[PDB]
């Protein structure tokens, strides 16, 4: 949910 | 012409019907009524954005890998399509930087949300560069590494190690160091320092998440050490 | 100004890389240039329209409810009202070009039998999604036109075809969720349903894997609409 | 599948 918004570059 | 609490709501609609253009289109106008956007705000333009840069990277990634395992009227193609998907990639990215120097970035008024858009801007910048001609990836390259750096002094300064967004960005700026910059022991240094930062820093609640971007930083370090 | 080769090859490519309305540009003008469709170019047009085509419906069934469940908000309901009205243009515009489409190029080509069941059916499908979103004045008009062309179909594929192969199959799973979804039915739903599987289960009995998933999707139906 | 261009229901 919330870290969906953070663009996360895994 | 609608007022904020109006493209808002279409903003939340257009979201749920997966129309992220347009989702898109209602967080831009609101972005531009020139107000600091609230939290909800905020998430709501990264949302939509997300989803419309990443439909096109995706894209990008599939369509650029089909013209190198090829070699042909086939791979001119393959080529100019690769060149029409990127343009549609520079314009959302334009908007998005654009919208973060003209609003986002001078309206922030909390730490946290100009280390955010800040981040944010490394980010746009990172997508630009992934796509650059090669003349001018040099120069776009440097605009994402001085917002990255902007951004990381100010989470130093004013946010604790195991915020979600100081980590967040700390995981994203080493994948740049990594990947963009071809710099894996800046990578390494930078998701270690930040990893044990937030470990030491267990003496914080309630982050499931802040120890989510912890686990994806160590999964990084241990593909990184090969 | 590009050749029906190279259309087909950019289709394929907006395939990959998940660009619908692409693939649907591309293979729209291939339809156009005339020609009969060979079996890939028509698979790719079927593609590439039920991706952009879906994406609205499922766009529309959300918004839809949505304003269903607004009860209260003087405008939370209205603006509700005016996104499904924009979504349900869009979709009229993408079955109108489909429709057309098949009426002056699919159909009067159709050489051979599994393609004129093909595209009949896919009439069927495209006017029954219509009728999904039509206010009731044009809503028994165009009802009739999906029965219409389901049932053409189903005349064809009855003296032509496999009671096992997939597009018959296909076509009657069609028809009868039309029949139950669409006209209110619930029999005549069960019986085409019940001696399509039937049948199929007749001529086994004397490639089909993907019969039978057709087979057992018709039979959850039938389980699911007699309970 | 080979079936995603039938457009099945359900």
Sequence with gaps: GXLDXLDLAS | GM???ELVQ?????????????????????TEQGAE????????????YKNVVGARRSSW???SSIEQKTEEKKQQMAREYREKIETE??????????????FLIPNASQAESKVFYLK???????????????????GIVDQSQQAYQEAFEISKKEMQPTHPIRLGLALNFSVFYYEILNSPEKACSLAKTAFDEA???????????????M???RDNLTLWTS
Tied chains: 1, 4.
């Design chain 2, 3 to 5: 007022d904020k609490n």
């Design chain 2, 120 to 138: 944010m801007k490394g980010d746009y910048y990172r997508y630009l560069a992934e796509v650059a001609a090669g003349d001018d990836k040099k």
């Design chain 2, 199 to 213: 470990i030491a820093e267990l003496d914080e609640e309630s982050y499931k998440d802040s120890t989510l971007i």
């Design chain 2, 37 to 48: 956007l609230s939290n909800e705000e905020r998430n709501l333009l990264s949302v939509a």
């Design chain 2, 10 to 30: 279409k903003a939340k609609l257009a979201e749920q019907a997966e129309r992220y253009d347009d989702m898109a289109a209602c967080m831009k106008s609101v």
């Design chain 2, 215 to 217: 686990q994806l930083l």
């Design chain 2, 89 to 102: 990639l520079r314009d959302i990215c334009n908007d998005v930087l654009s919208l973060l120097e003209k």
């Design chain 2, 61 to 63: 990634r599939v369509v």
